[PDB]
Structure formats: structure tokens, C-alpha cells
Amino acid sequence: HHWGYGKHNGPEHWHKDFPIAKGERQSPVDIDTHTAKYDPSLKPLSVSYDQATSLRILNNGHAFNVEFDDSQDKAVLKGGPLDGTYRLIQFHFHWGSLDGQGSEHTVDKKKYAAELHLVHWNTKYGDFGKAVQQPDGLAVLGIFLKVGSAKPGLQKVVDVLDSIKTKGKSADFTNFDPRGLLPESLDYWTYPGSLTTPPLLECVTWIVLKEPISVSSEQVLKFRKLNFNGEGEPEELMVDNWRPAQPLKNRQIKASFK
Template sequence: MYTLVIMTWLTFVIIPNVNGFGYSKKEQHLWPQKYKLCTGKLQSPIAISTSKAIPLPLPALEMIGYHDFLPMPLTLVNNGQTIKLIVNKNVTYGRLPYIFGAILKQNQQYEMEQLHFHWGTKNNKGSEHVLNGIRYPMEMHIVHRNMAYSNFSHALQYEDGVVVIAVFFQLQDEQNELLQSLVSKLSDVQWAHLKLSVNISITLASLMPLNTDIYYIYKGSLTTPPCSEAITWVIFATPVPISFRQMSMFRTLSNGEEILGDNFRRLQDIGQRKIYVRRLYPWLSVKQDNSRWNFSNLSWFWS
């Protein structure tokens, strides 16, 4: 079990409202007027069906540094549209957590930028992606930048620029102790456009599902403007537990005018995109020569 500890040093900053978009049906309809990419053919989120996904014994997604504490202080932000946890890259630190493997390009590594959440005002909605007809009450996105590019804005200009790990949350009666230290700080950024600098001893592994063997992967976009189509999505099938009480803490937050919630984008057309799912077949020995599987040349689209 991973330990999360909250330190006491806090600094508050008011941040301006510069987001320029909303989540109501009408507001989402207006996104393309200001952000042309939102009408693209590789938009996210999408509905995922196991029966339509292509099963393959794909390599594991390697998550390096996920068991290490993130460098402190971290920044917790209520920007009026979501809650973000941002790493401070100016802190003298070893390497930030990064990922590689799966069917990402060889010799490319993706470093963590930030994580954030999407949730509903009711228990039957909240997640952005839908898996086998289920819309979970919350979804977390861990955003990673391809280290071949100098910064996040630069990375968004390339189709291999960003990888986002998506994790679903499923309600249960018992409190998830691994979430509690983070959840307990939400009240400190209850109001919109607050930024909180805090020492939170937290690992990314403590926010992940216990089973990361099965994941879905596809090519898509940011789910918020500017909707850049530079995202490789990795979506874990196993949800993380969260208690009803912990979920309610997210629903006490404000977006500046009302309760912050239902901050998920409507589903987008899959189009000609392929969705792969990692399956480990019993007959495929880990010692077997997998040279016949050329994952590097897999097509992302139906011809």
C-alpha cells in the first residue's frame, strides 16, 4: 500500500478566468466557432466496446517513477472547469515520472505534465469515455508530453506529441484511503480560479488501478479546446474505488457561478479509427519469441 501524507504549508493564489469555454450543451456546440480543430475527425472522447476493439498481446505500458513521491511543492488548481494537480518542474529533482512501451514509438519517452479530473453531479455520469455502455462517475487523466518536444504547446503540434492515461473511478461504500489525502485538500480550492501550493506526499501509483494488465489504446484529441489531435489515449479497464463521501467532495466545488460538475465532453464519432485492447493469451508464453508480432507497424485506421 502506498502512503499519502499532507504537510501543512499552503500558499493561495487567485488565477484569472482565461479558459473561454463551457460544458453545457449549447456551449460545447459553440466550441468550433473559436477552436476550429474541435470539428476534426480524430476527436475525443469516444464510446469503447470490447467486442469491437482489436485484441492483441500488446507490450505493457511501462510507468517509470510512478511509485516515487512527486516533487514538492505541488500545485492544486480549481480553474473553474476542473481540478488539476501540477508538478513543479523548477524543483531540483531527479526525473519526473514518465512512460514508454505499449505500441508507442520506440525510443520515445513521455514525461508527466499534470493530472486532472472529470466528474458528474450524479452517480450515473461524469466520465468522458464510455466503456461497454458504462459511464463512470469520474475519470482521471494523467497527461504526458513527448520529451522529444521542448514544451507542451510544442508537443500539441505533432501527432505523437502527447499520451494521456485515463482511469475510471467506481463508487463503493468504503473510503479509499489512498485518495483521502488529496480529497481532503479539495475544500481549500472550493472556489473557482484558486491555486493552492501544497506539500502533498503522493505517488501516481496510489491513484492507479491495481490491475493495469488490460488497457485500450487509440488515437484522439484533447477533450477540451483547442481539441488538438495529438493525443494517444491509454485507457485502463479496471476502475479505482472511491467512496460516496469522497465523490461528494468533488461536488462541493464551485465553477464561479454554480456547482462544478458535469465537466465532460459529449461523445465523438469514432469514424475510421481502430481501438486496440491488450489481451494476454494463456497460450502466449512470456518466454516465447514474439518477433512475429510487429506492433510498431500497426495501423491506427481502417482502410
Template sequence: MMTNNGHTANIVLPLTNNGQRAFIEGGLLPGTFEAQSVHFHWGSANSRGSEHLINGQRYDVEMHIVHKNVRYATVAEASLRSDGLAVLGVMLQAVPSLISTHFGLNRILDRLPQVIEYQSSTSIAGRLTMNDLLGDSSTGRFYSYNGSLTTPDCAESVTWTVFSDSVKLPRRQIAKFWDLLDERSLPLINNYRNPQEINGRPVFQRTLI
């Protein structure tokens, strides 16, 4: 189910076919983390909206796949713990192409016109895998660091994994984000937090050879 919550288009991820949740572990992750939700940050027709910059480049949209440490019962509880959350960041780049092979992501973006109004919701039919969300990003190339949520109260409870590769999507698909409205019926655009100082945090990079 995807919902316009006035801040973003948020997707609550269901259980998998075997009744469990997709999970990630390894690397800097302090435990096993189950996938909970997906949301997006974007700019406007005249601005790019990713919250991370890679080699100084900002992308049109940044997708966040939010995971919760299995040690904690809820996301709210996990957000209070330094090892509580893990977020995968995927950059989406608008290109002039009229054709895209990222069928999973396009299925999501095709439903955005159904959630233009605040608090409106829509279902995304069919099977959707984590690979569908990641597009053709190489999962072996990423940056990782310990940081915070990017929305208030910006709790420092997140192990970030930001993939180096961007996923290219037709600009007409990216443009659907700009039609969404917030709780005041104003355009829901530029819903990103500006990059913050590193403040001495180590940032690790993994690059496949």
C-alpha cells in the same frame, strides 16, 4: 499543487525525489513521455461524468494523467504535434462504502474543499507515487488509441491509454467534486465532453491472461 482553474481541479506534478519526472513508454507510445499534470472530469449528484465509456458503461469521474513527449519543450508545443502527448485515463466509481484503502487518491480528494473557489489552490502534502494515482487498477488491462484532447481546441495529439478497471471510492469522496465553483461562482459540474465517433480509428485492447 492543486488549483481550481474554472474548468477542473488541476494538479501540476513536481519532479520526483531524484530530480527527474515519472515517465511511461512502450506499447503504442511513439517515444518516452514524462508526467506533467493530473486533472478530473465529473458529473453531478444525478449524472456520471467520465469521457470514455467501457462496454457501454459511464463512470462517475475520469482522471487524466497527462504526459508530454520528451522531444518537445512544453505541453503547448507538444499539443501541436501528432506524437506530442500521452494521457492515461482512470475511471473512478462511487460506492456506498465508508472505508477506502486508496490513501493516495483520498489524500487528493480530501483537499478538494480547499479549492472550491475559482483560482484557489492548495498543496498536497507528503509523498505521492504514480501507483497511488492508479489505485488498484491493473496496468496490464487497457484500451489504447490515437485521438485528441477533450478540451478546446481538441488537438489530435494524444495517444490514449484507458484502463479497463475502475477505482472504487466512497461516494462521499466523489461528492466533493460537486461543490467546486467555476469563474462565475456557479456549480462546476458536468465538465466532461460527450463520447465522439470513432471515425475509423483502430482501438487496441490489452488483456492480461
């Protein structure tokens, strides 16, 4: 029926409705650190989020998205392997039912507790919907989360989750600064890939940061209290909303560092 992360509608079934699931540039992938090519031609990333305007948080039934005003160049990403300016539209996470799983990308087969995706679209295409139809339409920054110390900048998100527990619920979420979610270092790996949920379009330049951020056990516990279902439907906790690693095929992962 409709796609999800269960036994009957999970990632191994997606190809029946979205054949591109077996495509040549699907994400996520495992990052083999000894095979990644250092590329000295890659520039440092430029993250300009000081004028970011968050608007709302929404449970869409597969994750929770924090959405931003993308009608102007307020929160943008440029540099790195990118040509042009990419505007932030939303961020969301993928997480597990246990601390030893949850991330989509892996590093030398190591899985993290969760993975944050900051989604941006190439302004040359005018809107998000046109951007997803192009090979260079989106840039996603992926950041791993490990369990350890609490991340103060994540607490405002954790605290509003009770108000969007079920699918289709939304809440006003203004004045949230996404700078509180970045690691200290911006070293990264990059490769050409896709969206990790249907429609699985191959329009993404992924930028995965080497340095994870730490979150407390209590913080991730609050993520696992969300629901996949809508209000008044049988409760299905929102956990393990990650797609496993896909074949690298004819692709090279480049590193911005050595």
C-alpha cells in the same frame, strides 16, 4: 462567450471557436469491447512514478489540476503503444452531478461516476507547448472511477478541495504520490485521439485502463462542492464537466488483452 459546460457555452457550441471539434480524431469515444482488436504486438505499460514531485493544486475553472515538476525525467510513462518517454505534467478528473454519469470515455455505452486523466508529454519535443502541436505529443492515461469503497490514496486530494473552491485559487500540494490512484491491473485499450477540452488538439495517444478504481460516495460528493465561478461571483457548482462521446471515424481501438 467563453467555453464551459453550460447550456449556452457547452460542448455542442465549441466548434464555433474551435473548428477542430468536428475533426477526424476527436475524443472521448465509446469503447465497443467486441470490436476492439486484441494486438499481441502491444507491450505492457511502464509507469515509473516513484520519483514524482507534486507541486500545487489549482482550480482553473473547468476542473482541478494537480501539477508536477516536469523539468526532468522524474515521473514517466513508456512502453505500451508509445515510442519514447513521456513525462507527467498534471492529472485532473471529470465527474458528474449524479453517480450514473461523469466519465468521458464509455465502455459498451456504460458511463462511470468519474474519469481520471494523467497527462504526459513526449520529451523529444522539449516542452509541453511544443508537444501539443504534434500527432504523438501527448499520452493520457484514463482511469474510470466507480462508487463503492473509499480509495485511501485519494483522501489527501479530497481534503484540500475546500481551499481551492473557486476559479483561480491554488494551494501548495507537495509529496502526493500518484501511485495510490492506480488499479491493480494495467491492461488497457488504446487509440489515437485528442484533448477533450479546447483547444481540442489531436495530439493524444490515449491509454484507457480496463479496471476502474473505486471511490466512496463521500469522496465524489466533495468534488461536486467545487465552483466553476471565481470568488464573489454567483455560485455555479462544478459538476458534469465531461464531453460526450465523439464519432470514431476511421480509427481502430486496440486492446492489450483478450
